[PDB]
Design a protein around this motif. Structure first.
Motif, PDB file in Angstrom:
ATOM      1  N   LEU A 287      52.632  -6.509 -45.304  1.00 43.23           N
ATOM      2  CA  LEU A 287      52.062  -7.296 -44.216  1.00 43.23           C
ATOM      3  C   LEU A 287      53.146  -7.750 -43.249  1.00 43.23           C
ATOM      4  N   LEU A 288      54.151  -8.431 -43.788  1.00 41.20           N
ATOM      5  CA  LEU A 288      55.246  -8.952 -42.984  1.00 41.20           C
ATOM      6  C   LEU A 288      55.901  -7.844 -42.168  1.00 41.20           C
ATOM      7  N   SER A 289      56.139  -6.702 -42.806  1.00 39.03           N
ATOM      8  CA  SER A 289      56.784  -5.573 -42.143  1.00 39.03           C
ATOM      9  C   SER A 289      55.934  -5.046 -40.995  1.00 39.03           C
ATOM     10  N   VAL A 290      54.636  -4.900 -41.245  1.00 40.01           N
ATOM     11  CA  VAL A 290      53.714  -4.363 -40.249  1.00 40.01           C
ATOM     12  C   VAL A 290      53.683  -5.225 -38.983  1.00 40.01           C
ATOM     13  N   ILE A 291      53.856  -6.536 -39.137  1.00 40.20           N
ATOM     14  CA  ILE A 291      53.932  -7.426 -37.981  1.00 40.20           C
ATOM     15  C   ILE A 291      55.101  -7.037 -37.084  1.00 40.20           C
ATOM     16  N   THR A 292      56.237  -6.722 -37.695  1.00 36.49           N
ATOM     17  CA  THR A 292      57.447  -6.419 -36.937  1.00 36.49           C
ATOM     18  C   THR A 292      57.422  -4.965 -36.483  1.00 36.49           C
ATOM     19  N   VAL A 293      56.717  -4.123 -37.233  1.00 34.24           N
ATOM     20  CA  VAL A 293      56.423  -2.771 -36.779  1.00 34.24           C
ATOM     21  C   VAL A 293      55.611  -2.849 -35.492  1.00 34.24           C
ATOM     22  N   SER A 294      54.615  -3.730 -35.488  1.00 37.74           N
ATOM     23  CA  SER A 294      53.799  -3.972 -34.305  1.00 37.74           C
ATOM     24  C   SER A 294      54.644  -4.442 -33.120  1.00 37.74           C
ATOM     25  N   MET A 295      55.456  -5.470 -33.342  1.00 34.39           N
ATOM     26  CA  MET A 295      56.308  -6.013 -32.288  1.00 34.39           C
ATOM     27  C   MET A 295      57.291  -4.964 -31.790  1.00 34.39           C
ATOM     28  N   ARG A 296      57.879  -4.225 -32.724  1.00 28.60           N
ATOM     29  CA  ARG A 296      58.880  -3.223 -32.382  1.00 28.60           C
ATOM     30  C   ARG A 296      58.269  -2.048 -31.623  1.00 28.60           C
ATOM     31  N   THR A 297      57.063  -1.644 -32.010  1.00 30.00           N
ATOM     32  CA  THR A 297      56.406  -0.497 -31.390  1.00 30.00           C
ATOM     33  C   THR A 297      56.140  -0.760 -29.913  1.00 30.00           C
ATOM     34  N   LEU A 298      55.637  -1.952 -29.614  1.00 31.27           N
ATOM     35  CA  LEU A 298      55.314  -2.326 -28.244  1.00 31.27           C
ATOM     36  C   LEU A 298      56.570  -2.332 -27.381  1.00 31.27           C
ATOM     37  N   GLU A 299      57.667  -2.843 -27.936  1.00 36.83           N
ATOM     38  CA  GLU A 299      58.951  -2.820 -27.244  1.00 36.83           C
ATOM     39  C   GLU A 299      59.307  -1.384 -26.886  1.00 36.83           C
ATOM     40  N   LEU A 300      59.205  -0.498 -27.871  1.00 37.29           N
ATOM     41  CA  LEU A 300      59.518   0.911 -27.676  1.00 37.29           C
ATOM     42  C   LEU A 300      58.596   1.569 -26.645  1.00 37.29           C
ATOM     43  N   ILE A 301      57.326   1.175 -26.635  1.00 35.45           N
ATOM     44  CA  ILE A 301      56.367   1.712 -25.667  1.00 35.45           C
ATOM     45  C   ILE A 301      56.702   1.239 -24.249  1.00 35.45           C
ATOM     46  N   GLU A 302      57.473   0.162 -24.145  1.00 30.71           N
ATOM     47  CA  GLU A 302      57.874  -0.357 -22.844  1.00 30.71           C
ATOM     48  C   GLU A 302      59.212   0.230 -22.391  1.00 30.71           C
ATOM     49  N   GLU A 303      59.912   0.893 -23.306  1.00 28.74           N
ATOM     50  CA  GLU A 303      61.199   1.502 -22.982  1.00 28.74           C
ATOM     51  C   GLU A 303      61.066   2.911 -22.409  1.00 28.74           C
ATOM     52  N   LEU A 304      60.026   3.645 -22.804  1.00 32.86           N
ATOM     53  CA  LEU A 304      59.960   5.061 -22.446  1.00 32.86           C
ATOM     54  C   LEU A 304      59.622   5.187 -20.958  1.00 32.86           C
TER      55      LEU A 304
END
Length: 1044
Positions: free
Chosen positions: A1020-1037
């Motif tokens: 659960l905890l990891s998936v939250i940061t996976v979520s946060m990290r993914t959005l960051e990455l989607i804003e970088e491309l």
DNA sequence: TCCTCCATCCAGTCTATTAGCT
DNA sequence: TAGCTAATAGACTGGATGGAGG
């Protein structure tokens, strides 16, 4: 005296009842005198016993005790010895004195008195001890002291702390116990005689209303009487010419509707008729609905030959129900008010249809009428205009039609003489259900009385089977109404056609009936024009209805339906839309939305369900205009997002017709798509698979086991165990089939197999292997890991046998130790937004949406690692592009309606970079550094999960892992990362949760998956940061641009 | 014939929250 | 009353199955 006729009946029923039972009740109005009858009943048991027969007659008041003691001896045919027990000596007298043993409360006196009775040189036939409930204990004090048991015990005024002592043998020793009163119900409700395992069943009953007629919502008994009727037939069927006549009655029924009907089903249909006939007679009062109607007559005829054969209507038990109706329908729109109730009270409960909203029904009538006017110049009420309601149900689409006519007549635009002919000749409708037919007839007949005329235009049929085959009669007058209808040039077809695409498998009773001549029509039209190769929906009942109506319609006419609105935008309906555009000139499509087989934002946008709890499908009103013209155009309107059920109806009451709707002119495209049309420039982009120069050589689609509860689970051990149960259960059914040799078939086998879903989860393929004699071995090596849902990996028994569709998984994951990468994607016609999630394991079909495609990195061979794509760089480039916000937003339609196409973009090597990072993140989703602000409070080390939750609705700050652990300060934006229509975090909440399978009773506990008690919490905890990290990455491309 | 396998859309039912009951 | 049951509001799944191609 000589016992009255119904008393004899009561006596007969009593004897019959006490033959097997030991407790019975006796209900009679105060008028008849149950006291006399009780004596006569007591005599009959006395006749049988051949010894002194002992009766206990319990009574409340003293006045009754004396009235019974005296009155019995006068009416007694037998030799009777009487006994009184009471604190009044005078209570045993009559003029007369000391009638029987004197009254007493002394148990020792009552015991010694019986010793006297035995000491006699001769004993009388039966001994009747009359006693008060108050002093009943002295009997207990007697039976203990040496008093015999009671061959019979009778409680009068039975609606009644010693009053309750009688029921148990412990207080009074007696073999049988009869209960007599005139009023088991005490007036809320304080006292009612409903057995309570004590009073017992009732063998006789007399209503006060009966006696007056005899010259003197709780219904489960309909089952009892019907079970008697249904069974007596099957028995008498067995070469009794009744069978020859009844087997002729079923064939007549089979003629008018279906071969689906047989002895059982047909017999059941007549049961329902027998029950409701008196109700209909009672409702009519003055003029009989039954004698007039053909089906009634046809039913009231067939009963005769059976009635002749020593078979009666067993509905004597139902008479108080009939009496209530007779009362309710005496004298008297106040009559229609009764029709509303009786349906909801009796019929709903009694035997157990969809009630169509009036705002909907009215809408198309006006719309159909105004169409007939504006176009043809004709109207609803012309002589050469005929209206068919092929699925009348309750005739709502007629009731509201003649009501429109009434409104027209009052406005003066219409003659009642113009109405009358419609009702008589020009209005037609039909139903496939018996009770729906009757009710539909009356409701039209009754609503016509507003201006007694039976409705001549109603049939009882399957309109689909009507045009199927053209080839002794019952109901011969019935189809005559239809035979004569078949020559009519029907100008308008109206109603609410049935919705059915299939079932869930083991409800074998349900499967869309085969209509070969209509399927071929569908096949040559809708299916032929399709590009799909998967056209299950095109044989949906509502699509059949449009087909059958399109055929039955004439070149100058109209249709008006409320239907499943799927075909508006649907993968397998591209052909139907191609047909309707050619077969019709003007088509107004009113999309009412309301599809609640969606979820999340899509669910909220859809909104209210037009039929409420009646249907979950997308609803739409379609009015298809057919004239002679070279003009072809579509008129479409979306009712709008988010509207409530009655917000949508507020518009239907507000706008009564399609004249008042703002229509959008639609020009269908190459793909025959009306809405969400695609970009033809998108085609320039490199195909992903199945074409020349495609990026992947082979694409697969997610696995479908068709039996997840058995074959998939969080616990590897549970899979191994559960699969073995079913495999054992299956191989037993086969062993059974082995020694009953026949020519078995993939469908006929159903009758010879278990159908219990706690044993086997049947599927088409599994039945096929049961038609043959095929067994299996349980291969423990076949149990492997797979992505069942996003970020949720369960254990799966991947086995070609016991998995309905294994797909190309054996090529991409030959065994449980294989190594492959596949990019799961939303597939071809999800309503939710397009998403993609990479997996290291075999993937279910529902990893993303309802149909998920995956794009493997490798393919294998057994004869063999093969590159399914040029390079890792190209692989991750695709994954990068599928995350581009601009890409997803610009072509939402192409991403929904077909496999993605990847363009060549200006900053490609950047897409590869983030492609790799995203992949790296989504593969290691189960262990990731916790985000900054989040905090985890642990009271005690209980890491077991029941069901995770937010403390209140829509608080995204907090998650209660359990009653020990909670998580706080979760960033609310993390819920923006969505796969399918659901946030990644919410999937963990949803999936990692204890639940059982209602059908199979198989439990699935996520704590048994991982061996590490902190796995799910870590996940659960990891998936939250996976979520946060993914959005960051989607804003970088990079910024989305063409041409490298 | 019948089997293998692609393909796609489903005429409510369960749980959660709030208000009552002795 | 403490802690149930009843009334009301909210949420949203796994699979059947026609037909091309053997």
């Amino acid at each position: 005296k000589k016992l009255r006729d119904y008393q004899q009946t009561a006596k007969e029923n009593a004897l019959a009842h006490f033959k097997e039972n030991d407790r019975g009740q006796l209900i009679m109005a105060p008028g008849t005198g149950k006291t006399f009858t009780s004596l006569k009943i007591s005599e009959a048991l006395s006749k049988d016993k051949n010894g002194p027969f002992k009766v206990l007659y319990l009574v409340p008041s003293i006045q009754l005790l004396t009235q019974t003691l005296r009155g019995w001896n006068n009416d007694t045919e037998l030799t009777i010895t009487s006994m009184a027990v009471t604190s009044d000596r005078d209570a045993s007298r009559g003029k007369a004195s000391d009638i029987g043993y004197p009254a007493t409360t002394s148990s020792k006196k009552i015991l010694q008195n019986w010793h006297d009775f035995e000491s006699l040189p001769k004993q009388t036939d039966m001994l009747v001890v009359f006693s008060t409930y108050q002093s009943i204990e002295v009997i207990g004090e007697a039976q203990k002291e040496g008093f015999p048991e009671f061959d019979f015990i009778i409680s009068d005024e039975a609606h009644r702390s010693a009053f309750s002592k009688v029921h148990s043998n412990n207080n009074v020793k007696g073999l049988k116990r009869m209960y007599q009163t005139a009023t088991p119900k005490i007036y809320i409700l304080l006292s009612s005689m409903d057995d309570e395992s004590k009073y017992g069943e009732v063998f006789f009953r007399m209503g006060f209303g009966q006696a007056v007629s005899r010259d003197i919502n709780w219904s489960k008994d309909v089952a009892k009487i019907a079970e008697r009727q249904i069974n007596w037939i099957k028995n008498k069927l067995s070469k009794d010419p009744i069978s020859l006549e009844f087997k002729k009655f079923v064939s007549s029924l089979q003629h008018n509707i279906n071969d689906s009907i047989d002895e059982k089903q047909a017999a059941e249909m007549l049961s329902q008729h027998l029950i409701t006939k008196p109700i209909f007679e009672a409702l009519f009062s003055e003029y009989s609905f039954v004698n007039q109607n053909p089906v009634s007559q046809a039913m009231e005829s067939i009963v005769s030959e059976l009635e002749k054969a020593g078979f009666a209507k067993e509905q004597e038990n139902l008479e108080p129900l009939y009496e209530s109706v007779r009362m309710r329908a005496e004298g008297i729109e106040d009559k229609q008010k009764i029709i509303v109730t009786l349906y909801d009270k009796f019929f709903k409960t009694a035997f157990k249809i969809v009630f169509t909203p009036i705002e909907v029904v009215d809408f198309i009538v006006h719309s159909v009428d105004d169409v007939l006017k504006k176009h043809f110049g004709k109207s609803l009420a012309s002589k050469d205009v005929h209206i068919l309601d092929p699925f009348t149900g309750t005739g709502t689409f007629i009731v509201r039609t003649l009501t429109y006519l009434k409104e027209q007549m009052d406005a003066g635009e219409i003659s009642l003489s113009d109405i009358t002919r419609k009702f008589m000749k020009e209005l037609h409708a039909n139903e496939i259900v018996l009770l729906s037919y009757y009710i539909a007839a009356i409701n039209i007949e009754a609503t016509f009385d507003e201006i007694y005329v039976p409705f001549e235009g109603i049939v009882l049929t399957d309109t689909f089977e009507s045009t199927e085959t053209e080839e002794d009669d019952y109901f011969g007058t019935n189809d005559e109404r239809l035979k004569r209808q078949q020559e009519v040039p029907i100008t308008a077809i109206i109603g609410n056609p049935p919705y059915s695409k299939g079932q869930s498998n083991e409800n074998d009773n349900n499967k869309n009936i085969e209509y070969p001549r209509l399927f071929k029509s569908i096949a040559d039209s809708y299916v032929k024009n399709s590009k799909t190769t998967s056209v299950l929906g095109m044989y949906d009942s509502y699509v059949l209805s449009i087909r059958w109506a399109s055929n039955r319609l004439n070149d100058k006419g109209v249709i008006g339906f409320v239907s499943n609105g799927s075909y508006i935008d649907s993968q397998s309906a591209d052909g139907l839309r191609k047909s309707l555009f050619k077969e019709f000139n003007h088509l107004y499509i009113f999309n009412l939305r309301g599809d609640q087989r969606t979820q999340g934002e899509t669910s909220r946008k859809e909104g209210g369900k037009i039929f409420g709890s009646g249907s979950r499908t997308s609803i739409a009103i379609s009015i298809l205009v057919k004239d002679d013209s070279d003009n072809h155009e579509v008129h479409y309107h979306d009712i709008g997002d988010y509207l409530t059920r009655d917000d949508k109806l507020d518009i239907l009451r507000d706008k009564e017709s399609i004249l008042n709707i703002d229509w959008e002119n639609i020009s269908p495209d190459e793909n025959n798509d009306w809405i969400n049309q695609r970009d033809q420039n998108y085609l320039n982009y490199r195909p992903l698979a199945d074409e020349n120069g495609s990026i992947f050589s082979v694409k697969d689609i997610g696995i479908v086991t068709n039996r997840d509860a058995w074959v998939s689970n969080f616990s590897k051990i549970n899979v191994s165990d559960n699969v073995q149960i079913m495999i054992k259960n299956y191989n037993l059914e086969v062993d059974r089939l082995e020694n009953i040799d026949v020519k078995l078939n993939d469908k006929t086998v159903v009758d010879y197999v278990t159908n219990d879903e706690r044993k086997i989860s049947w599927s088409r393929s599994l039945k096929q292997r049961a038609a043959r004699r095929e067994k299996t071995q349980f291969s423990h090596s076949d149990i492997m890991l797979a992505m069942y849902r996003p970020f949720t990996k369960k254990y799966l028994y991947r086995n070609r046998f016991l998995n309905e569709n294994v797909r190309k998984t054996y090529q991409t994951f030959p065994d449980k130790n294989s190594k492959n990468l596949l990019i799961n994607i939303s597939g071809q016609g999800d309503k939710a937004d397009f998403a993609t999630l990479i997996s290291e394991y075999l993937s279910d079909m529902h990893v993303i949406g309802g149909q998920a495609r995956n794009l493997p990195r490798f393919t294998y061979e057994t004869d063999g690692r093969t590159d399914n794509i040029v390079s890792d760089d190209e692989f991750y480039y695709v994954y990068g592009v599928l995350h581009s916000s601009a890409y997803r937003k610009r072509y939402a339609n192409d991403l929904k309606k077909d496999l993605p196409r990847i363009p060549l973009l200006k900053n490609k090597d950047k897409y590869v970079e983030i492609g790799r990072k995203l992949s790296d993140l989504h593969l290691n989703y189960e262990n990731q550094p916790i985000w900054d602000g989040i905090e985890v409070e642990i009271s005690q080390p209980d890491y077991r999960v029941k069901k995770m939750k937010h403390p209140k609705k829509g608080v995204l700050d907090t998650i209660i892992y359990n009653e020990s652990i909670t998580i706080k300060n979760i960033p609310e934006r993390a819920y923006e990362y969505v796969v399918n229509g659901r946030p990644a975090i919410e999937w963990i909440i949803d999936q990692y949760q204890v639940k059982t399978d209602k059908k199979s009773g198989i439990t699935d506990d996520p704590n048994e998956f991982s061996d590490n008690p902190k796995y799910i919490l870590n996940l659960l905890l990891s998936v939250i940061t996976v979520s946060m990290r993914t959005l960051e990455l989607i804003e970088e491309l990079p910024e989305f641009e063409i041409q490298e």
